[model samples]
Target chain A: VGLSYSQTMLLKDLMGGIDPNAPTWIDIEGRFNDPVEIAIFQPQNGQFIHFYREPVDQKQFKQDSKYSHGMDLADLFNAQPGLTSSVIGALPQGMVLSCQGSDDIRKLLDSQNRKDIKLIDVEMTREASREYEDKVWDKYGWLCKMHTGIVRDKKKKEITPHCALMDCIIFESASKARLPDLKTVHNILPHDLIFRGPNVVTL
Target chain B: QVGLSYSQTMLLKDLMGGIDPNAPTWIDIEGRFNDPVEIAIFQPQNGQFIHFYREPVDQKQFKQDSKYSHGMDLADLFNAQPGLTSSVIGALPQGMVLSCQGSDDIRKLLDSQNRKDIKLIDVEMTREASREYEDKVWDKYGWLCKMHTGIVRDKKKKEITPHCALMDCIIFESASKARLPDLKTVHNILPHDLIFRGPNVVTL
Candidate 1:
């Protein structure tokens, strides 16, 4: 009725190691867990790379596979031109692409049938991303709060998703540009960057 | 020694009032009980004058003679030239000074003045009397009224007068009194007066 624990365990065991062309699926009772959640770097290169699920419209897929109901992964990557190439070219060999820690997500990667990509478990990337987000908040929280107030109901004490997304873009751009540090990034960007909204105002 | 209350008032009023509305009046007067009118006048201008007169007898002999009688003659001197007395007193050192002597003597003096009710009398007399009478009466009555006279130096310490070393003196004296240089004193001794005293001394 389900993929034996041994079969699932076998796939889990291959995470963060040099196994490619390996199985990325594990079946559950009367359903299949397919595709991946997060996948990082290939096995031969020593560079950092990652892919994550983007939240999509739930209404479109009423009975879609719960694991992979969002936008097609390839279409998602295709929307951002040069994104896949950038990830592949920038990453060095021997760095494993650690996939999200779920049976369906593994099956999603298994379906891709990309033998060159090695999959690892999601724990390390998840932890690292969490820490990175915390650090970003620590450095730019005040600016974000200021922007949050403008875009959201202040009484609700919530920051709009767009406000948060803008903050991530600014933080990432500054980081990628090789600014000296977080503080330098913070200073270079205008304090009211996200609040000003788009090309009409400077970020 | 003797006179009635009316005799004192009559002399005092004559000393203060004018002989005629338009003409200058007597500046000084001295007389005995039986003598005719004796007076002197100082005419600063054609019509304006200062008058002076004397009580014929010592008023202390009379039971009804007021306490003010003793200082009346001195008061007349002050009334004659008010500005001169103020200038002299203003120039003298005032405020409490640390006495170098021990408490024994100053305490004794304070006690004696209190016993005789002379402390109040001294201050009243100094205020009423001319500058010339001040020191004489202070010595006669006792120097326990330290309100005007700078406190005397007792034996244990030698506190210098603020009259020396002008800037240090002012700062030091003002610090002791918990006051800035008095506005009256500053106004009285204007910048021009300081300049007149010394060309190098700037007001600022």
Candidate 2:
């Protein structure tokens, strides 16, 4: 499941023409009876996650530097089994996770550091809004002005840092399940949660 | 079998990680056999040949004409080969080959005309960009970039240039295939394209 499986499953999902629940119909794993299904899973073990939500404000962002950052999906996923070696599909909103080795499917069910905060934590303020909007505006204008405008317009927007982080986590879990050989099975997950309390498992 | 040209032959040799006498080899074009071409040898079919070593040159500023003669035309240095261009220069300032023929010829022609300060811009021609550009051009032309570039290009300035009047040539090989995200053919259009231009460009 390392590099090969990670790419195959992610590619299947990207086709969109496939039914998510029934994506296995694509013969991704061939006739292998116990084929692994990739999905977003919770990290168990001693895993901890921290999340902050704030308004889309620039001033607030300036006051709180955490708003304008994104996590590397690959690095995060590498924490999972056999997933570090594989590469993931990059979504306009973010990138996918590669292969890694460990599989604590139980980790996915863990109630460790995972927490969801407010959106305000990453939003831009009015003053800072201009720059963001301006960049988008230039891009939008270029799309319409260039001969290739129509095609450019069809392009998906860049993945936001928050979305990228989430996708990385989801893919990371999937990679571990898919490729357990490349990852290390550590009994201890990161205990330190950042700026937030541990996320309680809802299910 | 993809027909191998002389230049392509030389290129394939380099791509094979270099000429190794101890390494078993053959000389079949179009992959008649998996033999690699030797350096500097020019195969006529594709006119693939080994190019001369290009030393980094920036001594024009220090030349006798520097004070008044509008500086040397950096383009002139390029003219020494005749086959090269901004777009088709392919790998330059890194792995640039001095071609005296082919499309690279025109590139060198233009280089000879320009007289100004020029600096090499380093660019890594990753397989990713290659595949993206391939998909992009193919989506529009139903063929790869080289396919189009290989066809005869008439319709010059105002006159209609005859088809096949100019020989078509392909320079870039499928190394682009390796760099492309290992997505399935089905994923080629949608997500692949998105991923091509997404966060990668912004972060860059």
Candidate 1 local lDDT, B73-180, one digit each (tens): 323322221111112112212222221112333233323322222111111112222233333333432221121123323245453221111122232223333443
Flag regions of model 1 displaced more than 4 Å: A1-78, A81-95, A99-105, A122-132, A137-203, B1-204
Q: Cα lDDT of all candidates, in order?
A: 0.26, 0.22
Q: Model 2: share of native contacts present?
A: 0.00
Per-residue CA lDDT of model 2 for B6-99, tens digit only, reads 2222232233233222321111111001110001212223222222211113343323222232122333332222111111122122233322
What is candidate 1's TM-score against the reference? 0.18
Q: Is the docking of candidate 2 incorrect, acceptable, medium or high quality?
A: incorrect
Angstrom error of the Cα, residue A189, model 1: value is: 22
lDDT of 2 by residue, A108-130 (tens): 21111111211111222344433
